[PDB]
């Protein structure tokens, strides 16, 4: 065939050790660009004026950070949502001061990860598989979009995007609590149910299957040798597992259908994490957690504090201290 | 269905940003100020107040070294200072009379701010689109009293939720449509499992 | 897709027990340390640098400022038996807020 | 940065001692009769 035809055949080959594909044609270069820029910035970038007040924050290892404190720091509040590619800067030195690497990394990463999701659909189709693994990955992907793109858009600045760093992440969490009372938001509560329940059902499933593995090995060998890649026979007794779990709770609380069981395993965390993502993405537009501050009042009108008011006091501590030189007027409105 | 799901998802996202930023087809008289608008209105409010008290707002250096009221944008335009520096792209009818070819004009600021501009800027500052899910208006630490969540927040948040789940339905249905068209949406044929006819990866 | 995959179903399911069970056990140990205030609160090298260099700032120093706000603002109501009275003038606050 | 001077050796041995334990066990497994 012609060059193009052979190229297409190669790009879409089910035979490549790593699947390429058309999504991969975009994913590969964008992920490589984000990864390389990230690694170099995390090691060597100079301090970045995240809040646009000429107060540069040091993110990199060579400038006095460790793995836990280091970050690629968000772009300057002076930039806002303006697009700041390298060629918009007068010099690499200016680009670095203003947090150019952050934009480069996150835009390439978001594009690349969205293509990772497409690529998962793509390969499933090449392999004659059902197509929805890519829908499960939409949950973490939605969450990355929420913290690196939707939230900054709502608030008018990439300087309020999540920093690319471990301590930076906690900074974002704490400020987010002061500003949105996220803990009191039901979508974040559903996210907690999603991740705690995902952990729970992960352990539950692991333990129930492990508990009913069919004896195929001796006491000297790992039982894992009792399963051979590609064998036709199921390797555990689901009727035994259901027999156990139906008795632990009650019969109709347990699955005896593996397909229903595995659907539940997919659905519970994916749905909870979609609500986590939508929590961040709607607090992006300042629809915030429940506010019961001073909700309980006695017969005279004295305020009777509840645990909500004690939350409020912790939130106030975060609010009054955060970005301590950046506010000149009494309300923090974004 | 799937092509339409993708298109409605896209349109949903667009509407979200429209109601959040645009004050022409979503007049602030009816929908409340935009987030950028209310933040700028706050700086305007205190510039007005403090200049009434005698401050020279052009020369007032804030704690950071940047002007407390007025500073430059990264391309030189005179803009409000403090955190609202991010919102200098904002434009609205109550503010434009103060803007000259170089951005905010100090002489117009010192001499031409009308009472209707002060009122609008105080109204918009105090109707910023921030509030709780139970409709307590204000920052998250605010006490109960003011029953307010901006129509802008309700409309942006709802449409983002819808647009997102519509993206999910697009992927759900576009991938199902592909699989059903090729004949494997119900599972893999045990005697015609494609991967068993392929060479090993290694 | 990812470069690696399970090939052993038994290993897969044991790993699903292993990961969350081990993570919860690790969190429990950190909490036993917090029972004694034996915290990972600080990096001493960060503090020595920041004490001597008022231009040195990291996300780690930013978060301790948040902690200091949380302690001062929440303690009087959260710890009523202490009878804390913190006059306005002593409360840590940044500019304006 | 004024780091703990024992950080380096603690980190080095933390990696090396169990990594070498594993390598010893892997290699002698491979050398067992095919």
């Amino acid at each position: 065939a012609n060059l193009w035809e052979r190229f297409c055949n190669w790009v879409t080959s089910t035979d490549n050790r790593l699947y390429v594909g058309w999504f991969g044609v975009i994913m590969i270069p964008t992920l490589l660009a984000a990864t390389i820029c990230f690694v170099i910035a995390f090691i060597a970038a100079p301090p970045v004026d995240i809040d646009g007040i000429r107060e540069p924050v040091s993110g990199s290892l060579l400038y006095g950070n460790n793995i836990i404190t280091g970050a690629v720091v968000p772009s300057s509040n002076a930039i806002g949502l303006h697009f700041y590619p390298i060629w918009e800067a007068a010099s690499l030195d200016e680009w670095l001061y203003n947090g150019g690497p952050y934009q480069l990394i996150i835009f390439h990463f978001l594009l690349g990860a969205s293509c990772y999701m497409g690529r998962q659909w793509e390969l499933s189709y090449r392999l004659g598989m059902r197509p929805w693994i890519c829908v499960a990955y939409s949950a973490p992907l939605a969450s990355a979009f929420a913290v690196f793109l939707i939230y900054p858009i709502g608030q008018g600045s990439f300087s309020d995007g999540m920093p690319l760093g471990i301590s930076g992440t906690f900074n974002f969490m704490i400020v987010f609590q002061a500003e949105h009372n996220i803990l009191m938001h039901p979508f974040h509560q559903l996210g907690v149910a999603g991740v705690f329940g995902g952990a729970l059902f992960c352990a539950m499933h692991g333990s129930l299957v492990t508990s009913s593995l069919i004896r195929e090995t001796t006491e000297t060998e790992s039982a894992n040798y009792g399963y051979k890649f590609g064998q036709e026979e199921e390797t555990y007794n689901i009727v035994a597992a259901h027999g156990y779990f139906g008795r632990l709770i009650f019969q109709y609380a347990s699955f005896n259908n593996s397909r229903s069981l595995h659907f539940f395993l997919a659905a519970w965390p994916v749905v909870g994490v979609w609500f986590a993502a939508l929590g961040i993405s709607t607090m992006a537009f300042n629809l915030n957690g429940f506010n019961f501050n001073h909700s309980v009042i006695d017969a005279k009108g004295n305020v009777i504090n509840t645990w909500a008011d004690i939350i409020n006091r912790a939130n106030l501590g975060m609010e009054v201290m955060h970005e301590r030189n950046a506010h000149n007027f009494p309300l923090d409105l974004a | 269905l799937s092509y339409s799901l993708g298109a409605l998802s896209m349109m949903g996202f667009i509407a979200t940003c429209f109601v959040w930023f645009n004050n022409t087809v979503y007049p602030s008289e009816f929908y409340g100020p935009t987030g950028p608008e209310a933040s700028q209105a706050q700086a305007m409010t205190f510039l007005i107040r403090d200049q009434k008290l005698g401050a020279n707002v052009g020369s007032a250096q804030g704690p950071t070294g940047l002007g407390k009221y007025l500073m430059r944008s990264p391309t030189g335009e005179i803009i409000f200072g403090g955190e609202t520096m991010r919102f200098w792209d904002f434009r609205g009818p109550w503010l434009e009379p103060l803007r000259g070819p170089n951005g905010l004009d100090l002489n117009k600021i010192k001499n031409d701010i009308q009472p209707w501009q002060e009122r609008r800027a105080a109204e918009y500052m105090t109707h910023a689109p921030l509030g709780s899910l139970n409709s307590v208006g204000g920052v998250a630490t605010e006490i109960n009293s003011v029953n307010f969540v901006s129509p802008r927040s309700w409309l942006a948040t709802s449409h983002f939720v819808l647009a997102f789940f519509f993206l999910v339905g697009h992927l759900w249905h576009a991938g199902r449509a592909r699989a059903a068209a090729a004949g494997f949406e119900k599972g893999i044929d045990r005697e015609s499992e494609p991967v068993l006819s392929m060479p090993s990866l290694d | 897709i990812f470069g690696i995959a399970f090939s052993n179903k038994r290993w897969l399911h044991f790993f699903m027990l292993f990961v969350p069970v081990t993570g919860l056990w690790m969190s429990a140990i950190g909490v036993v340390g917090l029972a004694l205030n034996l915290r990972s609160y600080d990096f001493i090298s960060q503090e020595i640098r920041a004490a001597e260099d008022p231009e040195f700032e990291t996300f780690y120093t930013k978060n301790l400022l948040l902690n200091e706000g949380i302690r001062a603002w929440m303690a009087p109501q959260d710890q009523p038996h202490e009878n804390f009275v913190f006059p306005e003038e002593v409360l840590p606050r940044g500019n304006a807020l | 940065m004024e780091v703990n001077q024992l950080g380096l050796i603690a980190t080095a041995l933390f990696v090396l001692v169990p990594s070498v334990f594993l390598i010893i066990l892997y290699v002698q497994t491979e050398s067992q009769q095919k």
């Binding site: 050790r17 290892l61 890649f229 | 090993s200 290694d202 | 690696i4 995959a5 | 780091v3 980190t11």
Partner: peptide, 30 residues
């Protein structure tokens, strides 16, 4: 010395990724 240590561990992990993918124990059917 600390920067060197952190980057050294990181580099070992990326190398490990490479061997774990391209020099894995190949999966063999049955």
């Amino acid at each position: 010395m600390e920067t060197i240590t952190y980057v050294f561990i990181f580099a070992c992990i990326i190398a490990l990724f490479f061997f774990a993918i391209f020099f894995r124990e190949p999966p063999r059917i049955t």
